[PDB]
Amino acid sequence: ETVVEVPQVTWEDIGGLEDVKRELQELVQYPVEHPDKFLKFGMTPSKGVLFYGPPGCGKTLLAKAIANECQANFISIKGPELLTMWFGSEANVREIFDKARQAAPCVLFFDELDSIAKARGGGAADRVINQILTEMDGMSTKKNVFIIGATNRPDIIDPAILRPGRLDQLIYIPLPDEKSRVAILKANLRKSPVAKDVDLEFLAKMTNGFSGADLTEICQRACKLAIRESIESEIPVPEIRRDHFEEAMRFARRSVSDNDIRKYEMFAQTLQGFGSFRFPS
Amino acid sequence: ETVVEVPQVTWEDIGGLEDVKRELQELVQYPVEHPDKFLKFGMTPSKGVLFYGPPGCGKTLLAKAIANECQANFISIKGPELLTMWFGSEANVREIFDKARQAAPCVLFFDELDSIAKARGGGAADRVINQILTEMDGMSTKKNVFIIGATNRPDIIDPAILRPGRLDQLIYIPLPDEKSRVAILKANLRKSPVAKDVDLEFLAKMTNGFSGADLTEICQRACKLAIRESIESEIPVPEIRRDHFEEAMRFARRSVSDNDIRKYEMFAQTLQGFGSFRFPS
Amino acid sequence: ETVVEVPQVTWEDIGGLEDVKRELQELVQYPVEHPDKFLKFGMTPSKGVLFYGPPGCGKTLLAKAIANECQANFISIKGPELLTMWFGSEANVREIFDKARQAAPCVLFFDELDSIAKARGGGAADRVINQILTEMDGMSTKKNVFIIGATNRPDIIDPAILRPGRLDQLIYIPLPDEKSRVAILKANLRKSPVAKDVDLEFLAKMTNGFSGADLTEICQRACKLAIRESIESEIPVPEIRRDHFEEAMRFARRSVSDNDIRKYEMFAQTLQGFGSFRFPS
Amino acid sequence: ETVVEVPQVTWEDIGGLEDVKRELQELVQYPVEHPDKFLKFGMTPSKGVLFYGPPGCGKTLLAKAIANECQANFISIKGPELLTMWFGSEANVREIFDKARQAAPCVLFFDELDSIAKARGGGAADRVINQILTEMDGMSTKKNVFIIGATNRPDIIDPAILRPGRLDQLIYIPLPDEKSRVAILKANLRKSPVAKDVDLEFLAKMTNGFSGADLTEICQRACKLAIRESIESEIPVPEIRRDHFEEAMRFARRSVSDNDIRKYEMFAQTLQGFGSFRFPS
Amino acid sequence: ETVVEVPQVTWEDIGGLEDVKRELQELVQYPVEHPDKFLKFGMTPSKGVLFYGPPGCGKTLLAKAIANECQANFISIKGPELLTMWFGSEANVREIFDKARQAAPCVLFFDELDSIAKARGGGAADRVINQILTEMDGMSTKKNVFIIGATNRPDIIDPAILRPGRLDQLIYIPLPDEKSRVAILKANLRKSPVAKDVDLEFLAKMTNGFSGADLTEICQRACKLAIRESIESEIPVPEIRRDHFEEAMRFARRSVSDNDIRKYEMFAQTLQGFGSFRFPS
Amino acid sequence: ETVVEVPQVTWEDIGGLEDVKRELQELVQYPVEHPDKFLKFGMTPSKGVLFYGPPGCGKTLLAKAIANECQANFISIKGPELLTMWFGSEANVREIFDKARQAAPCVLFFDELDSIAKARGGGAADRVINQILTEMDGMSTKKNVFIIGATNRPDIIDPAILRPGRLDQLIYIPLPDEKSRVAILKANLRKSPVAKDVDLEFLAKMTNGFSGADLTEICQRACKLAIRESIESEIPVPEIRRDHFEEAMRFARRSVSDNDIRKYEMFAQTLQGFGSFRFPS
């Protein structure tokens, strides 16, 4: 069944994205720690955020990290489960939201919620989507239940979701930058024994269009090469030599083509005038 | 379940639209206050109205305001509910109308009733819509039950709905004008503490193509900026200063493009000759 | 449930269409008053007529009037009812026809029976329509039950209906003429108090392309203006003054465009040679 | 060859359109009579106007009338001439513009200048159009040459012509109103002998959707009926009796369907906000 | 024939766009004033620039202004000229380029060179365009001939043009900013007599989505209203009163819809990574 | 007219592509220096090669380099020139080939000969292309004239060209490699004064998907920044500092998207089994 537990991954697992870090902090951590400030100005906190961007950029990791910062429970619903509600039996959504309700500080996370529209392609609408919207509107908003939905194809999302009182804050998660890349390497690589002069900074520099998944795959390949060498030795070397990394590098491949990056950037810009508005004074 | 209660929002929450305000007054308040006038001339009052216009213009607020002026109960059915009856279970419409019937002075309000046609795109027809029409025709019309339906896409509405004995009076709700804009700011902003020389009139003047939702977003952004500043101070300032508003303005965005406004104006004109007809005398 | 009662509307409600009035008289009133004459010549009376023409011309009123002249019970089935049995549950047709059969002098009236085809747009065929055809063929024709079907779009009617033993006599009901217009005004206006120099004949002259619905709307607008004036006076004038009319007239709008009228005329002409046939003598 | 002469038709020929009459007066008559006022404010007069509207509404009559009011020479280029220098030999446009240049107070009039695009249906552009544009831009504008272009289908006009320094003022000429209708009857009927109680005001009232061409056809038919009766008498009655008009009316037909009128109205509305702009004071 | 003169319009006429002003200064001024620095570093100056953006933003004005800064001759070729030598006679391109060659400091300006592609809708290619490319490649580049091409539809431009040795620097000219708007008003209005409390800054604030053409139309309308008032008075007031403006404003319309602005912004972004590249040090 | 001169560019201007360098050496050098070996085996040398690959990779530079190593004359025909023969005048091809024939050791180079097919989008055939084929087949092949054709879109080339006795050897020129990149920088940068610790090796490392044109743009931008700084100083620094480069780099963009690279690789693989064929021995 659903796992409702405080994630252990922290912000340091992705060193970059300080802007969205702060934006998330002020969207979940501020309503919860300082409700007395929110009822001062009569502001109603938002209860929905939509992550969009190219695959393998850390959207799930971002949701887990924000849940960890506020020590809020994390409930994760996957795309296959959404498609099984759709193909089936869509009343399970209500009990999912009830499970979230039981734990007041909950970051409900719908992963690839555009899967229904991907599988359906008649307008953008599915019984599961409408029941999710009904449950979301029904949420009192007094609870600390905060919904996050990650998507790779925001262009096909049903516009009904993008409404006030629902997922309204669209956040763009771009490909990792050099500092974020080295942080993503350090995480997911520190577990393995690495020594010699493996300059993770050099790899961060060289890998430019790579995503988190690509760096994960490259570290995976280096570990596998080390394991193969050690096995051949048995049939020592308790660390991953540089040679392993520089051999695994030439099989490194980028998952997202620059055309997709251009499309995501066009979307982000479309969601972007006055510029310098000043009162008469 | 359905909430059947007299709305508290008033006309002052939307300052403008005096023409449609009077038109609504003579469509709901006149049949109820002065039935003795209606049976004098043998006129049968209309029991249906269709609000159409760009999103976020106050159609729901208008329905609630007219219900408040007559002190009639308000029942609100949302688009997700309509779509779940469609995808489901359309016989719930009958009990919804029964609930409305129990309270004689009732403004039944169907929000985004074009949702079924949006999700369906066969011809313009739906089991839920036809059952709604059956219930509409069956209504005695002696009761004070008055139906209002709000739509953003009247072009795709099934023509079955638009007919005498059904939603016949089509009313256009355009974007707020400057006086309406300042009224919408004063409401939805007066709750929060605002001080200094924030000239809401100046904001009303500057925001020209904005809708009610855009002004709501801008006020919420200003409140959030004030909250962030106060929190940073703690980790005083009991009012939203001008700086907050003039910093939130540069993120202000218009939701309805002028192409959609042109389309709505074209529709309204199409629903618009004799000009000067006089008896022979 | 179904209302089975002799209509009270008479022929004078629509003063024109004397030709189709006589044609209906010889199609319903002749078989019933003088069955002995019909069995003399072995002629089998027709048991079906199809009304077609632009909307709001008085087809339902015509059916009620012919039922009233023969004092035959009137059973009216609406388009929403047909569409719900289609979307549902088509066996209700059998019990509807049974109800008609219980009252021997019955004018069964299917209104907008093209509604199913409109909602369906696969060839011209529907479960409810075929069951109606089965029940219509099964009718003994010894009973005085006589079917009438009103349509706005005869071009999409399933040809299965148009055939001997079914709806075969297609009758064209055009827009009202000036005499018919003044009659349609006097009826539905005489109930209200009208005085001064309201020249209903002048209004009939002016309104040329108008239908019954348009004139009804004009009269209702005049009544509403009078009611508004009287209410404002209270917050006298016990009659609708000529000013009220000549004011409401400038909002008068035609419902049927000239293109639709041209299309209906084309259909009627297509349903229309020998010209002068004579025996050799 | 081209006829360059001051037209004899006047404003009284078409009684209505006082608004566009004044507008044309201030576009042609003011730059010519009072250049000393134009050089005061540095205002550069416009040298182009595009008439658009349903056919047979008096656009050519309006051009001739404005030429007559200013006593400016009138040069008329027809649609067939444009299509022949298109299909042919487009350099003759320069000759035409030179002829206009010779007469300084000239109202150059291009009739149905959309004929090229109608015959062409590749983007909206033809060599003759571009040469007309070249000659129009080359015009000094110090001369008094003022271009007018009448169109029935402004939607297909090449956008290049709708530019500043070219045909920029688009004027909408709707169907005649009652006063305009009676004027259009009096003119083009006064020549013939009409007597008895022919009440042209009654005809103006009756004919509502009619254009100038339709009224001209009515008068033509009445004259033809009178001629036929007189000839039959010979093989007296030197006046057109009311019987002739009342018999010719029943053959009266409208040339422009209300769909086209609605399309023209939608275009005009598209070419129609601030509403109440005021200085801070 | 072609007019080859140093333009008189200056930068002050278009107040804003200081960034592109500097960019143009370093594309035309630096090569001409300081060739001794260009041959020092072996850098070959670019001989082509493409202006793109929404219509009526001052692209022609920008070309004239840059020509005026360097006191270089200005040759302007119009779109109709290009389309006529396309429909014709493309060898005249060589004559034009020879005319430019005669004057060494020349800013050759091709206006709406996308006109041929617009009129053509085969692939993107035209004999005139290819001959222009041939003559452009043939240019020695030792001369001071600098080509500028303005376009409203860069998306349909033949890619042949966009290449090193041709129009390579694509420059985006957006809608005027408030400072640019007030500058555009001050120019084009200062010639006329304006007095009272006409606050051009207030108009600049109010007009937000307006272009240069829209402001020019506003000023022209105000001048025309003043002229009409003065002429009526004659049939004094030698200044345009604030009433004239605040009356002309309500007729003000925006020429470029925000959808087109969004498209241009998306193009500019597409033409817009490393971010922080630094040497190892 | 055509320039027939031995190119001065050498192989060192692109340090990579040693494989294709040797392939070209054995296709032009060997037939020319050692005909006595070709007539020994009866081998008939090929007189045609087709360069294909992404734009801006040095195909023209490769043709010039091979012409330089053999000290053969170089004749370059451009795409615009082909398109003007096409749109015009294809008999000029014969005199071009005659000019080539006059110089026996000639490398005739047709640049972007796919330009005609691009402008044409009817099968792949063009009067100019067929005349080129005729002139190419007719050539004795005893002469030393050798034809090279560069194309960016080999997929749309007319297959008639890809025949024995014509352009037959298709050679793929991919994006520059690391050593090729550093060589392309060293050339095209050595002319300018560069000093400090500008580590061209580091730039070669970092720029991975870049083409020759992209590196040229980087170098030009750095030179332009240096020139601007020197001018501002004057209104010293006789070298391009590291700041100039590392600042120009962030504006660097990749001209060829990885999708195009994938398509070119797919084509190359398609033109790419036995694997290990050995005689029975």
Ligand SMILES: CCSc1ccccc1NC(=O)C[C@@H](C)N1Cc2ccccc2C1=O
């Ligand atoms: C927002 C990009 S969504 C996307 C991302 C990766 C892979 C594929 C896609 N979608 C598509 O390719 C569909 C095509 C028709 N586009 C293109 C596009 C560009 C910019 C904005 C919106 C659209 C859109 O709907």
Ligand SMILES: CCSc1ccccc1NC(=O)C[C@@H](C)N1Cc2ccccc2C1=O
């Ligand atoms: C009444 C505008 S309804 C609308 C509003 C916002 C966003 C989209 C829409 N519909 C459409 O765009 C469909 C297209 C085909 N149009 C255009 C149009 C203009 C004027 C009248 C009716 C139509 C219509 O059916």
Ligand SMILES: CCSc1ccccc1NC(=O)C[C@@H](C)N1Cc2ccccc2C1=O
């Ligand atoms: C009999 C007219 S039925 C009609 C009436 C009002 C509104 C719409 C319609 N149908 C249509 O418009 C469909 C189109 C394709 N037509 C045109 C037509 C003209 C004359 C005869 C038959 C047809 C027919 O099938």
Ligand SMILES: CCSc1ccccc1NC(=O)C[C@@H](C)N1Cc2ccccc2C1=O
């Ligand atoms: C401006 C109406 S032009 C017109 C007038 C009479 C007869 C025919 C036409 N054109 C058309 O019918 C073409 C169709 C596709 N429409 C319809 C329309 C309505 C409103 C605005 C622009 C358009 C347009 O381009």
Ligand SMILES: CCSc1ccccc1NC(=O)C[C@@H](C)N1Cc2ccccc2C1=O
């Ligand atoms: C660069 C916008 S060009 C433009 C400007 C104003 C008016 C019209 C147009 N072109 C179009 O609308 C054609 C359509 C198919 N689009 C859309 C678009 C958006 C962004 C980038 C390229 C394209 C393109 O080719």
Ligand SMILES: CCSc1ccccc1NC(=O)C[C@@H](C)N1Cc2ccccc2C1=O
């Ligand atoms: C050889 C790639 S040619 C190319 C290069 C850059 C930019 C565009 C193009 N052509 C195309 O895109 C046309 C499309 C339909 N493809 C795709 C493709 C892939 C692999 C082999 C042949 C084809 C082909 O004909």
